Amino acid sequence: HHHHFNLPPGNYKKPKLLYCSNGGHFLRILPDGTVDGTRDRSDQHIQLQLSAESVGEVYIKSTETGQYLAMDTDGLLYGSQTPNEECLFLERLEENHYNTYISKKHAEKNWFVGLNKAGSCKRGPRTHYGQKAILFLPLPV
């Protein structure tokens, strides 16, 4: 393992909103495959359904479009039509409270799902442990 194994509580029974306190944005996967953040709680592309593939390993999928969140070879988040190796994330508890998501494919490089204060997704290499951008709270839809 390249990472700890503290896991968050809660489950995958219902869909969630992934909220980032860094800039106050919800993770959003747009129909065209774009991924960013929005403060609009009424947005129809921020409802996500997570599922466990192995303990602590998840897919994060758009309930509206069916796309899977994925991180590419250059660290950019995108929406994928089909599940592939770039769509698996290591979901962990962080600061004894939040959820973080590390790219399984690039776990040895510590590339996280993260939103900057401007509401844009961060590129993998620009993320790292200790940032506020990588901290999410799963909220009810």
Swiss-Prot record:
GO terms for molecular function: fibroblast growth factor receptor binding; growth factor activity; heparin binding; integrin binding; S100 protein binding. GO terms for cellular component: cell cortex; cytoplasm; cytosol; extracellular matrix; extracellular region; extracellular space; nucleoplasm; nucleus. It is found in: Secreted; Cytoplasm; Cytoplasm, Cell cortex; Cytoplasm, Cytosol. Keywords: Acetylation, Angiogenesis, Cytoplasm, Developmental protein, Differentiation, Growth factor, Heparin-binding, Mitogen, Nucleus, Phosphoprotein, Secreted. Changing K117E: Reduced integrin-binding. Defective in integrin-, heparin- and FGFR1-binding, and defective in inducing FGF1 signaling, cell proliferation and cell migration. The keyword Acyltransferase does not apply. Signal peptide: none annotated. Residues 116-132 are annotated as: Heparin-binding. A motif (Nuclear localization signal) lies at residues 13-16. InterPro entries: Fibroblast_GF_fam, IL1/FGF. Its main location: secreted. In the nucleus, phosphorylated by PKC/PRKCD. SUPFAM superfamilies: Cytokine. It comes from the Eukaryota. Changing S120A: Decrease in LRRC59-binding. The keyword Lyase does not apply. Monomer. Homodimer. Interacts with FGFR1, FGFR2, FGFR3 and FGFR4. Affinity between fibroblast growth factors (FGFs) and their receptors is increased by heparan sulfate glycosaminoglycans that function as coreceptors. Found in a complex with FGFBP1, FGF1 and FGF2. Interacts with FGFBP1. Part of a Cu(2+)-dependent multiprotein aggregate containing FGF1, S100A13 and SYT1. Interacts with SYT1. Interacts with S100A13. Interacts with LRRC59. Interacts with CSNKA, CSNKB and FIBP. While binding with LRRC59, CSNKA and FIBP seem mutually exclusive, CSNKB and FIBP may cooperatively interact with FGF1. Predominantly expressed in kidney and brain. Detected at much lower levels in heart and skeletal muscle. Plays an important role in the regulation of cell survival, cell division, angiogenesis, cell differentiation and cell migration. Functions as a potent mitogen in vitro. Acts as a ligand for FGFR1 and integrins. Binds to FGFR1 in the presence of heparin leading to FGFR1 dimerization and activation via sequential autophosphorylation on tyrosine residues which act as docking sites for interacting proteins, leading to the activation of several signaling cascades. Binds to integrin ITGAV:ITGB3. Changing R39E: Dominant-negative mutant. Defective in integrin-binding and in ternary complex formation with integrin and FGFR1. No effect on heparin- and FGFR1-binding. Defective in inducing FGF1 signaling, cell proliferation and cell migration. Belongs to the heparin-binding growth factors family. Heparin binds at N22. Changing R123E: Reduced integrin-binding. Defective in integrin-, heparin- and FGFR1-binding, and defective in inducing FGF1 signaling, cell proliferation and cell migration. This is Fibroblast growth factor 1. One of its GO terms (biological process) is signal transduction. It comes from Homo sapiens (Human). It holds the Pfam family FGF.
